[PDB]
Design a protein around this ligand. Structure first.
Ligand SMILES: Nc1nc2c(ncn2[C@@H]2O[C@H](COP(=O)(O)O)[C@@H](O)[C@H]2O)c(=O)[nH]1
Ligand SMILES: Nc1nc2c(ncn2[C@@H]2O[C@H](COP(=O)(O)O)[C@@H](O)[C@H]2O)c(=O)[nH]1
Lengths: 201, 201
């Protein structure tokens, strides 16, 4: 009952989306924020599952309205975290996972100090290229551009609280579980959850 | 290869010693500091296993010599953490567990800032009395005195980073594992352990 935000960032092709989806299956009382994006809906994508897919007009509206807790521009497209959904989850006592880039992370850290951030590292640059190329949904020409953006994303790893290497899926998931589980044992969180016990003693 | 100190504190009778012993069996690269004490050696106690049992003359000597990283007086007896052994472990890249009281914790926090501290709570005051009474090695008259010292120890829980309830042994051990495991995934620790990978990228 002292819910927190858990920021997860990684270069494209690091396997972050899959890790986060397994994480929420393994843990209770934690949900993934579904972002809004102007990035074109790809074959395979599902509205309300991968993203809320909208156009620039809609997204710009939300920005001016202040509907986003956080928003950024990435590869000439827009992504943002709808503010109200997140706050409803926190109110309900559920932790929230934010799969956002380094720019969004900076915003969240300012706005919600207790937030913890985790950076997912690939075991090699070649691992990124491999995973990205195998996504037939993606253009195989923007690769050299996406990999360039990946190295720049990774240069920001120093801004994060934890680093986790995705070299073995199960182990990486287990490490994410350690990090969230430990947060939930912090004195600040426990003062609330153990209110009755601490009262007795 | 960025080893840390993990302080474990709890009122007498909370089952801390047993938890810590199971913890070191479950994790690698972590060792328990064996303290020096003037507290009389009890039936069942083993030299170099439970404590290094010495007399006041020896202990006072160590204090004046500065042989202790940390030392305190508890129930009119002396306990301390020999400094050199701990530093050797850290140098070797091994984390160190310190089973010390709240006074010792304050000293360690000053002396070694990265240190994390965990307070073990009993599920009830009656749990302490039960566990203590069942220790036939202990005098059953000092109980009301030890329980008084337990409530005063527990009032210091606010000085600790994490709170863990020992209501189920396996679960409490698993929570200790989360806490140490998460520390080892911190960016500061990972900058060292992942030096080669970060170099490649
Ligand atoms: N700041 C921010 N970044 C996001 C958000 N959603 C996705 N991203 C970032 O945008 C990148 C592009 O994701 P993609 O277009 O590959 O699905 C992600 O890897 C992530 O770093 C968001 O809501 N806010
Ligand atoms: N400060 C400090 N406290 C210790 C040390 N060793 C044991 N203690 C504290 O002294 C208490 C008494 O332990 P006992 O006499 O029951 O074995 C422990 O519960 C612990 O809080 C030590 O090396 N330093």
């Amino acid at each position: 009952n002292k819910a927190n935000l858990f920021i997860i960032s990684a270069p494209s092709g690091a396997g972050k989306t899959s890790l986060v989806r397994a994480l929420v299956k393994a843990l209770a009382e934690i949900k993934i924020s579904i972002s809004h994006t102007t990035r074109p809906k790809r074959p395979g994508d599902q509205e309300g599952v991968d993203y809320f897919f909208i156009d620039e007009t809609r997204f710009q509206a939300m920005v001016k309205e202040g509907a986003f807790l956080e928003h950024a521009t990435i590869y000439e497209r827009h992504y943002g975290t709808e503010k109200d959904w997140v706050l409803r989850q926190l109110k309900a006592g559920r932790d929230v996972l934010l799969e956002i880039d380094w720019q969004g992370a900076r915003q969240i850290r300012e706005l919600f100090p207790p937030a913890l951030s985790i950076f997912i590292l690939p075991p090699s640059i070649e691992a990124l290229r491999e995973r990205l190329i195998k996504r037939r949904q993606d253009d195989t020409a923007i690769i050299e551009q996406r990999l360039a953006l990946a190295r720049e994303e990774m240069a920001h790893y120093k801004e994060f609280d934890y680093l986790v290497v995705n070299d073995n899926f199960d182990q990486a998931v287990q490490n994410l579980i350690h990090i969230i589980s430990a947060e939930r044992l912090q004195r600040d969180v426990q003062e609330k959850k153990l209110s009755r016990l601490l009262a007795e003693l």
